[PDB]
């Protein structure tokens, strides 16, 4: 009956909790105490990109580490030249309620989405001289909150109806759909091997997923509020989270438990972004108090600030060669730091 | 430099086109259409002339109106309600035939952090059938603590006061109107409210506040 299955579920949860407790021997804090600190970081602004005029919402770097993308509530999608501060394209959108951006790894396509429950793809290499829509991927129920390319043919998307799907651009049909969340997915990150990925929802949980077979292999339940940002460690064996609880956590896949927490008593605002550095030693976070923060991934102590924005910092990213970091804000300004 | 002067010229053309579009796209008036399910938003937008957001627009006396109905998609409201700030006013509407959920929604919308200084227009629909129903049956069933007469005017005033009592901030104002059967006279209410709001905004911008 229902009582028997409820008791079985409770017993299984208690058993996995006991196994997780037993598998832990020491904490990383007392293993890392024998290394020297990094000092102070004094990065300064180098460029300011002023073309947008309403509440930039997303950005994405290019693989060449020179071209960017940005989306605004005004209804435009313009790609910049980072070195010389030039505009090279300006794609006009159909709906001004957009929330996501993505750059193809080959530099041929760009995707976007928002409150229209539709993901659209644009072709940058036409023989006529202008950018055009290629496909209209429809079939979701709630709003789209993240988009990520895998190659020139398939793309994985997260929506606000507690589902994620893998698409086929050549035919526009959902090959595999992922289910199991009880809230709505707000983030998505892809592993370097492009064989597994993780997601973060508003039920204060995250879980790993396999692209080949649509099954969930692990679950992490350390936070206390809605998850808002996700990213992998450079080697693909760990990931970090950000939540409205004004805290960040570092997890692990092989041990399957939380490792560190990054918090202070003088900050009470939520987290909007998270990203690592080239070597994984430095972790960057973007808060709602008009500024960012940098912390050691191995010691959990602040190492500087990135103040200079006049509103919420909503997006953040680091180039592939790890030479610069870019930030956006609701003040409609993009800044390049180094 | 090299022949990159052509790229610089292209960038200048892009910037000029963007500036022209921006200055040409700021003459419209944006409104939000919130309310309970089956309240009359569809009727009011049809008389005045898909899966996600649906937008309808009309022009009235050299003024362009943009009206957004984002209530058609079901999800957590707090996750996207910050996109609709910097809007002129809310066009909340109420039916008079159901009701506590609508009042709770009104309390939630009015006391938000993003909508602290946003005016509200309130519509009370279906007055005739409400009067017929209150003639047929007493209104005390819905409000246990009501102890006034059963006349239409007293009940309407009492329920309007009940809706308006949820307001707490004294700076904002709530425009309430009875939208019983009329020859499309409800556009004038929105026109007057928008005129007053834009006059106040212009006066504040100059520094007189």
């Amino acid at each position: 009956e229902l009582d028997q299955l409820r008791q079985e579920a409770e017993q299984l949860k208690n058993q996995i909790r006991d196994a997780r407790k037993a598998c832990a021997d020491a904490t990383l804090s007392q293993i890392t105490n024998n290394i020297d600190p990094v000092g102070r970081i004094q990065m300064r602004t180098r460029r300011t990109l002023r073309g947008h005029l309403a509440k930039i919402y997303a950005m994405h770097w290019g693989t060449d580490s020179r071209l960017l993308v940005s989306a605004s509530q005004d209804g435009k999608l313009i790609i910049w030249d980072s070195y010389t501060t030039n505009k090279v394209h300006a794609i006009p959108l159909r709906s001004s309620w957009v929330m996501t951006c993505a750059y193809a790894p080959s530099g041929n396509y760009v995707a976007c989405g928002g409150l229209d429950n539709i993901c659209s793809i644009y072709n940058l290499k036409t023989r006529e001289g202008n950018v055009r829509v290629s496909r209209e991927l429809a079939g979701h129920t709630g709003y789209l909150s993240c988009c990520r390319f895998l190659d020139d043919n398939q793309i994985v998307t997260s929506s606000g109806d507690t589902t994620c799907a893998l698409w086929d651009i050549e035919t526009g049909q959902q090959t595999t759909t992922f289910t199991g969340h009880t809230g709505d997915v707000m983030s998505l990150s892809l592993a370097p091997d492009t064989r597994l990925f993780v997601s973060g929802a508003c039920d204060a949980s995250a879980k790993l997923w396999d692209v080949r077979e649509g099954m969930c292999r692990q679950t992490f339940t350390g936070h206390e509020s809605d998850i808002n940002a996700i990213c992998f460690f450079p080697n693909g064996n760990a990931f970090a989270t950000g939540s409205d609880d004004a805290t960040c956590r570092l997890f692990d896949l092989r041990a399957d438990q939380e490792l560190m927490t990054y918090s202070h008593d003088n900050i009470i605002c939520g987290i909007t972004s998270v990203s690592f550095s080239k070597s994984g030693r430095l972790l960057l976070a973007g808060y709602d108090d008009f500024n960012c923060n940098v912390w050691d991934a191995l010691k959990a102590d602040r190492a500087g600030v990135l103040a200079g924005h006049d509103n919420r910092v909503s997006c953040l990213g680091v180039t592939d060669d790890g030479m610069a970091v870019a930030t956006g804000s609701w003040d409609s300004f993009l800044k390049i730091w180094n | 430099s090299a022949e990159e002067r052509a790229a610089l010229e292209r960038s200048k053309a892009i910037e000029k086109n963007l500036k022209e579009d921006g200055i040409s796209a700021a003459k419209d008036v944006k409104l939000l259409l919130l309310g309970a399910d089956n309240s009359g938003k569809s009727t009011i937008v049809k008389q005045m002339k898909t899966t996600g957001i649906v937008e309808t627009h009309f022009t009235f006396k050299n003024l362009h109106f943009r009206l957004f109905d984002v209530g058609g998609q079901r999800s957590e409201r707090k996750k996207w309600i910050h996109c609709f700030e910097d809007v002129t006013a809310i066009i909340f509407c109420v039916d008079l035939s159901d009701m506590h959920e609508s009042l709770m929604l009104f309390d939630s919308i009015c006391n938000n952090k993003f909508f602290i200084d946003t005016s509200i227009i309130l519509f009370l629909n279906k007055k005739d059938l409400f009067g017929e129903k209150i003639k047929k049956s007493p209104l005390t069933i819905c409000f246990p603590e009501y102890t006034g007469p059963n006349t239409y005017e007293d009940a309407a005033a009492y329920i309007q006061a009940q809706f308006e009592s949820k307001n707490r901030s004294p700076n904002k104002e709530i425009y309430c109107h009875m939208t019983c059967a009329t020859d499309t006279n409800n556009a004038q209410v929105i026109f007057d409210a928008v005129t007053d709001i834009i006059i106040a905004n212009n006066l504040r911008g100059c520094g007189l506040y």
């Epitope: 020179r66 001289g129 202008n130 | 090299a2 790229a7 010229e9």
Partner: single-chain antibody, 232 residues
Framework: DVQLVESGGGLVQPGGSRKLSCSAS????????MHWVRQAPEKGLEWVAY????????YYADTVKGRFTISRDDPKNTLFLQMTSLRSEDTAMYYC??????????????WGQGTTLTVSSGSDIVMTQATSSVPVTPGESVSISCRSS???????????LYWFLQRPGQSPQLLIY???NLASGVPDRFSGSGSGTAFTLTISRLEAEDVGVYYC???????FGAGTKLEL
């Protein structure tokens, strides 16, 4: 189906005037530049003029300044060139080319067909090619090289030299732009390399449909080469 069509040729007595028009279709005419290239009946290519996009910049050759003008009509999708006071040395074939400039573009990709104009009798970078006749058999490998006077490598790290191929009785075609990049359509067998002021072009596994005349052109500042021919 990108199309560039030119018309307006004929026989003009010396001292007269004539106009040539180049209509365009199949692409976005408002975002592209437009040059004009001419070649003598038994000589190489020569540059004439240049009209930009949203015309605000114009250029002319030394031997055509004062007698010719270039104009465009965007709504009608056509280009114009008015020539006055024609001499006896203007007998040539006039071409109509295409070019778009931004980070990562490929100018000079599409050429026109051309028209024949005849007249009755009565501080520049120099690029030189080595030879003018090289025989080769199918299945072998060849090498084409041309040299310049001053270095074509700028401070930003880009070298500007293009390679063109013209077949028998046909319009030329783009092969290599900026010394290392293959054009969109050329087979992988063609590759070019060089450094400083010495450049080479190598074609491996030579086919029967890759015979013609090869020209190398510079784009560092506002000229073509002599050209070399292949025989079967």
């Amino acid at each position: 189906d990108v199309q560039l069509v030119e018309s307006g040729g004929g026989l003009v007595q010396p001292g007269g005037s004539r106009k040539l028009s180049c209509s365009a279709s199949g692409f976005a005419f408002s975002s592209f530049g437009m040059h004009w290239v001419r070649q003598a009946p038994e000589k190489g290519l020569e540059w004439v003029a240049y009209i930009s996009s949203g015309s605000g910049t114009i250029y002319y050759a030394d031997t055509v300044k004062g007698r010719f003008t270039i104009s465009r009509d965007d709504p009608k999708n056509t280009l114009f060139l008015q020539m006055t006071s024609l001499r006896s040395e203007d007998t040539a074939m006039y071409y109509c080319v295409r070019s778009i400039y931004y980070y990562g573009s490929s100018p000079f990709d599409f050429w026109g067909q051309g028209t024949t104009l005849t007249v009755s009798s009565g501080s520049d970078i120099v690029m030189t090619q080595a030879t003018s006749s090289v025989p080769v058999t199918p299945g072998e490998s060849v090498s084409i090289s041309c040299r310049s006077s001053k270095s074509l490598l700028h401070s930003n790290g880009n070298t500007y030299l293009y390679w063109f191929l013209q077949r028998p009785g046909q319009s030329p075609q783009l092969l290599i732009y900026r010394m290392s990049n293959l054009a969109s359509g050329v087979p992988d067998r063609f590759s070019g390399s060089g450094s400083g002021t010495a450049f080479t072009l190598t074609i491996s596994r030579l086919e029967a449909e890759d015979v013609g005349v090869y020209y190398c052109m510079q784009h560092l500042e506002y000229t073509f080469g002599a050209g070399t021919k292949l025989e079967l």
